[PDB]
Design an enzyme around this catalytic site. Structure first.
Site, PDB file in Angstrom:
ATOM      1  N   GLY A  50       0.814  -1.202   0.000  1.00 12.16           N
ATOM      2  CA  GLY A  50       0.000   0.000   0.000  1.00 12.16           C
ATOM      3  C   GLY A  50       0.847   1.252   0.000  1.00 12.16           C
ATOM      4  N   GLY A  52       0.830   5.968   0.285  1.00 11.09           N
ATOM      5  CA  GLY A  52       0.230   7.150   0.868  1.00 11.09           C
ATOM      6  C   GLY A  52       0.802   8.394   0.213  1.00 11.09           C
ATOM      7  N   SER A  53       0.475   9.562   0.764  1.00 13.94           N
ATOM      8  CA  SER A  53       0.970  10.826   0.226  1.00 13.94           C
ATOM      9  C   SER A  53       2.387  11.087   0.727  1.00 13.94           C
ATOM     10  CB  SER A  53       0.049  11.970   0.651  1.00 13.94           C
ATOM     11  OG  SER A  53      -0.104  11.989   2.058  1.00 13.94           O
ATOM     12  N   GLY A  55       4.721   8.292   1.424  1.00 16.11           N
ATOM     13  CA  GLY A  55       5.598   7.326   0.787  1.00 16.11           C
ATOM     14  C   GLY A  55       4.798   6.066   0.524  1.00 16.11           C
ATOM     15  N   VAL A  57       4.066   1.673   2.069  1.00 15.70           N
ATOM     16  CA  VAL A  57       4.359   0.582   2.988  1.00 15.70           C
ATOM     17  C   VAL A  57       4.692  -0.639   2.158  1.00 15.70           C
ATOM     18  CG1 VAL A  57       3.546  -0.795   4.900  1.00 15.70           C
ATOM     19  CG2 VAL A  57       2.726   1.532   4.589  1.00 15.70           C
ATOM     20  N   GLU A 121       6.716  -4.320  12.835  1.00 12.85           N
ATOM     21  CA  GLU A 121       6.450  -5.736  13.004  1.00 12.85           C
ATOM     22  C   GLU A 121       5.250  -6.041  12.121  1.00 12.85           C
ATOM     23  OE1 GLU A 121       3.871  -7.526  16.016  1.00 12.85           O
ATOM     24  OE2 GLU A 121       5.728  -8.196  16.992  1.00 12.85           O
ATOM     25  N   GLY A 125      -4.359  -7.629   9.774  1.00 13.77           N
ATOM     26  CA  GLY A 125      -5.691  -7.320  10.264  1.00 13.77           C
ATOM     27  C   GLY A 125      -6.227  -6.013   9.711  1.00 13.77           C
ATOM     28  N   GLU A 127      -8.747  -2.300  10.220  1.00 12.22           N
ATOM     29  CA  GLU A 127      -8.885  -1.172  11.126  1.00 12.22           C
ATOM     30  C   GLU A 127     -10.069  -1.434  12.050  1.00 12.22           C
ATOM     31  OE1 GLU A 127     -11.261   2.115   9.819  1.00 12.22           O
ATOM     32  OE2 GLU A 127      -9.615   3.503  10.313  1.00 12.22           O
ATOM     33  N   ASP A 166      -4.699  11.428  20.837  1.00 13.31           N
ATOM     34  CA  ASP A 166      -5.338  11.009  19.591  1.00 13.31           C
ATOM     35  C   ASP A 166      -6.130   9.702  19.579  1.00 13.31           C
ATOM     36  OD1 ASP A 166      -5.818  12.087  17.036  1.00 13.31           O
ATOM     37  OD2 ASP A 166      -4.203  10.894  16.108  1.00 13.31           O
ATOM     38  N   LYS A 168      -9.077   7.245  18.933  1.00 12.73           N
ATOM     39  CA  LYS A 168     -10.159   7.199  17.946  1.00 12.73           C
ATOM     40  C   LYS A 168     -10.042   5.889  17.146  1.00 12.73           C
ATOM     41  CE  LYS A 168      -7.507   9.577  14.359  1.00 12.73           C
ATOM     42  NZ  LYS A 168      -7.260  10.871  13.658  1.00 12.73           N
ATOM     43  N   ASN A 171      -7.188   5.003  14.666  1.00 13.33           N
ATOM     44  CA  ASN A 171      -5.870   4.715  15.226  1.00 13.33           C
ATOM     45  C   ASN A 171      -5.745   3.346  15.904  1.00 13.33           C
ATOM     46  OD1 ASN A 171      -4.840   7.143  14.325  1.00 13.33           O
ATOM     47  ND2 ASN A 171      -5.167   8.218  16.266  1.00 13.33           N
ATOM     48  N   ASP A 184      -0.263   5.050  15.940  1.00 11.90           N
ATOM     49  CA  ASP A 184      -0.234   6.489  15.650  1.00 11.90           C
ATOM     50  C   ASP A 184       0.166   7.231  16.905  1.00 11.90           C
ATOM     51  OD1 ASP A 184      -0.807   8.785  13.808  1.00 11.90           O
ATOM     52  OD2 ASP A 184      -2.138   7.294  12.889  1.00 11.90           O
ATOM     53  N   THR A 201      -9.079  14.572  16.916  1.00 10.62           N
ATOM     54  CA  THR A 201     -10.393  14.689  16.297  1.00 10.62           C
ATOM     55  C   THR A 201     -11.428  15.299  17.235  1.00 10.62           C
ATOM     56  OG1 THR A 201     -10.070  12.891  14.728  1.00 10.62           O
ATOM     57  CG2 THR A 201     -12.337  13.425  15.383  1.00 10.62           C
TER      58      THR A 201
END
EC number: 2.7.11.11
Length: 350
Positions: A50, A52-53, A55, A57, A121, A125, A127, A166, A168, A171, A184, A201
């Protein structure tokens, strides 16, 4: 009283022992973070997991050990463009000093002319914000299972003088065993006393934060309240199409409890979603104990939870097969690092 009281005291003393050593291991890595504890040519690039903006993973395998890790790559230039320097340096520092079951694990860390690398690691799974949307609502016994792991996590993190501003669903992530793993820490902050920065948030901001008069660790407990609520209700307690309006609901402090909520749940939440931090559970004289000993957690075996010996309310589907339906489409380009250092100054500490 004699043997019975001595039993608790011993147990208590050992916990006091566990945090004490943990606090020391942390402090060490914290004021003297490890750097470049690995190299790129030590890993076998398997495939992109995957992007992101920032870089991307990548799944990798350690050549010597054979172990796989999630290696997120960050383009220093993009990180700087997006203004995430402080955020990134902070998260990497916390992650390399921290260590607890329900906390994501950083295995290696390094950087070169072009990027910053974080060999995580390998976890398998989804989110916890997606599963909540899917399942819709969790049963109290299930929500309890998660909230319990969160409680321990803050107990740990707090013993380290760290404030996780943070909490939520996004995370939190459920692993292959069905246990939580917080991922996060860009906003987390090491602080004794109070801090003033507004972050996190809206539906989760504790009154004091929005009230801008400073705030301490107690806001994570209020957030635990918001999470628990959202899990057992299916939606967050305070909501509005515009932030300002959510703030009003929070600072006012008038919550509406679903009617399916057990008395204990309604009671616990009233003390967690305490607008007056001075009367808020977790921030009182018995610290985390007012939370752990509450009626709603009466059936919780904290030690077992800690040891992941309780059966998760369900395990993520991805193991056993899939039929191509499990995954599809990802950028398969090569990694090209420059011969000239980039943003060398901004990421000196990494």
């Amino acid at each position: 009283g004699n043997a019975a009281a001595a039993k608790k005291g011993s147990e208590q003393e050992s916990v006091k022992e566990f945090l004490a050593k943990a606090k020391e291991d942390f402090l060490k890595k914290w004021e003297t973070p490890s750097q470049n504890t690995a190299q790129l040519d030590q890993f076998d690039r398997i495939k992109t997991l995957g992007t992101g903006s920032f870089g991307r993973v990548m799944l990798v395998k350690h050549k010597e050990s054979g172990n796989h890790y999630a290696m997120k790559i960050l383009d220093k230039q993009k990180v700087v463009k997006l203004k995430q320097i402080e955020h990134t340096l902070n998260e990497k520092r916390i992650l390399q000093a921290v260590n607890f079951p329900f906390l994501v694990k950083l295995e290696f860390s390094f950087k070169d002319n072009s990027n910053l690398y974080m060999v995580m690691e390998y976890v398998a799974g989804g989110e916890m914000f997606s599963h909540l949307r899917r399942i819709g609502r969790f049963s109290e016994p299930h929500a309890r299972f998660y909230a319990a792991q969160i409680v321990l996590t803050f107990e740990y993190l707090h013993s380290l003088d760290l404030i996780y501003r943070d909490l939520k669903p996004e995370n939190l992530l459920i692993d292959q065993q069905g246990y939580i793993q917080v991922t996060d820490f860009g906003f987390a902050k090491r602080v004794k006393g109070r801090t003033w920065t507004l972050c996190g948030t809206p539906e989760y901001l504790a009154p004091e934060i929005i009230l801008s008069k400073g705030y301490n660790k107690a806001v994570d407990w209020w957030a635990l309240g918001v999470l628990i609520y959202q899990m057992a209700a299916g939606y967050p307690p305070f909501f509005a199409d515009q932030p300002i309006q959510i703030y009003e609901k929070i600072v006012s402090g008038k919550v509406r409890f679903p009617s399916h909520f057990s008395s204990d749940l309604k009671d616990l939440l009233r003390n967690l979603l305490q607008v007056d931090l001075t009367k808020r559970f977790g921030n009182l004289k018995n610290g985390v104990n007012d939370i752990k000993n509450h009626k709603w957690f009466a059936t919780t075996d904290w030690i077992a939870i800690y040891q992941r010996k309780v059966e998760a309310p369900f395990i993520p589907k991805f193991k056993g097969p899939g039929d191509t339906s499990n995954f599809d489409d990802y950028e398969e380009e090569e990694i090209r690092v420059s011969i000239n250092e980039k943003c060398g100054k901004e990421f000196t500490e990494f």
